[PDB]
């Protein structure tokens, strides 16, 4: 009954050389790691080493063109880096960015391999840059390669092609890249909760709405839970898990669970505007542990209040370690009930548990 942890200080080297106060800070990962030490959680975990993803691994989800362009940034000069970053939606690049994105992915591959071989029951990956906005052919929203998507395909590559992987994306933003990568796939169930605001919230696309249920063989295997007009918090997230995430997940019966665990829905986040508490994230983690015989990998995505993300992700690791859930502190915001009912109607054709 062992929990893996991967963290490598080298991933701090990715930085914004024009705006050193950009919220996707190097110290996002060192702060989370530190909170694990001062809570004495780190000594309770088995440390899993980081490694570089290979280019062949990147090709599991990304085009050769995209891989070559990001790879080339390693040797670019500052003006050329600024030029190239400005060509994407919300990207900054330094000479170390490519290596850091490689390490983030390879860290998650090693963790998934530890889980699937039974060396650990579950694991946490304290990694940056994030992944879930990255598409097959382009970088986006602070993400270069789609770490969680790659890990799902890597896992299938060391087990069997049709291994059922559930990705739960509780980052406050829609994982546009993850949805698109698996949109026609019934082996990877993608469930995202996200602030939507009728398309006004980043990444600013109606792809995130509840009626995008998947395509082709994938119809039913893409579940968008979009929030509108409300400062959502633990009550809304508990209700979404009770009515939607957990029944669908149980029916799908995943063999591996990946959490795209952004902590920007947290109370205090400067961007998310939501109020999920650390005990909220602990309860969400604890519920997912009832799936896949406990085979859960928690992957850091976004989250920009250094205190909030450090407390929030430490509480997730505490639940993976088997600690009992802390106690939560209200009626759902009326628009949250609407959102949940919209998803319920959109997916009950495909999931009899709804
Ligand atoms: O955290 C994010 N995504 O997970 C994120 C964000 F919070 C922003 F404010 C952005 F402008 C952006 F491009 C992003 F990708
Ligand atoms: K999300
Ligand atoms: K899918
Ligand atoms: Zn986010």
UniProtKB/TrEMBL annotation:
Where is this chain's protein located in or outside the cell? Answer: Cell projection, Axon; Cell projection, Dendrite; Cytoplasm, Cytoskeleton, Cilium basal body; Cytoplasm, Cytoskeleton, Microtubule organizing center, Centrosome
Residues recorded as binding Zn(2+), renumbered to this chain, are 171, 173, 264
The organism's place on the tree of life at top rank:
Eukaryota
Which family does the entry's similarity section mention? Belongs to the histone deacetylase family. HD type 2 subfamily.
Its recorded name reads Protein deacetylase HDAC6
Q: Which organism is it from?
A: Danio rerio (Zebrafish)
Q: Which residues of the full protein are shown?
A: 290 to 645 of 929
């Amino acid at each position: 009954p062992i929990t893996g942890l991967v963290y490598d200080q080298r991933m701090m080297l990715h930085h914004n050389m024009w705006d050193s106060h950009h919220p996707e800070l190097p110290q996002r990962i060192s702060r989370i790691f530190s909170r694990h030490e001062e809570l004495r959680l780190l000594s309770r975990c088995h440390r899993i080493p980081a490694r570089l993803a290979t280019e062949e691994e990147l090709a599991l989800c990304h085009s050769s063109k995209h891989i070559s362009i990001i790879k080339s940034s390693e040797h670019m000069k500052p003006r050329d880096l600024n030029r190239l970053g400005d060509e994407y939606n919300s990207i900054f690049i330094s000479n170390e960015s490519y290596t850091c994105a490689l390490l983030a992915a390879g860290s998650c591959f090693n963790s998934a391999q530890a889980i699937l071989t039974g060396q650990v029951r579950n694991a946490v990956a304290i990694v940056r840059p994030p992944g879930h906005h990255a598409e097959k052919d382009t970088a986006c929203g602070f993400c270069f390669f789609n770490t969680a998507a790659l890990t799902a395909r890597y896992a299938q590559s060391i087990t069997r092609e049709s291994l059922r992987v559930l990705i739960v994306d509780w980052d406050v933003h829609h994982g546009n890249g993850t949805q698109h990568i698996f949109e026609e796939d019934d082996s990877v169930l993608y469930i995202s909760l996200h602030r939507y605001e009728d398309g006004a919230f980043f990444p600013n696309s109606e792809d995130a709405n509840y009626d995008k249920v998947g395509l082709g063989k994938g119809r039913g295997y893409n579940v968008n839970i979009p929030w509108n007009g409300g400062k959502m918090g633990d009550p809304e997230y508990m209700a979404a898990f009770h009515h939607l995430v957990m029944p669908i997940a149980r029916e799908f019966a995943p063999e591996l669970v990946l959490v795209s665990a952004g902590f920007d829905a947290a109370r205090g986040d400067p961007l998310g505007g939501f109020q999920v508490t650390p005990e909220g994230y602990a309860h969400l983690t604890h519920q997912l542990m009832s799936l896949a015989a406990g085979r859960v990998l928690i992957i850091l995505e976004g989250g920009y209040n250094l205190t909030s993300i450090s407390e929030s992700m430490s509480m997730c690791t505490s639940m993976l370690l088997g600690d009992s859930p802390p106690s939560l502190d209200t009626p759902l915001k009326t628009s949250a009930t609407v959102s949940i009912n919209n998803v319920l109607r959109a997916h009950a054709p495909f999931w009899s548990s709804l």
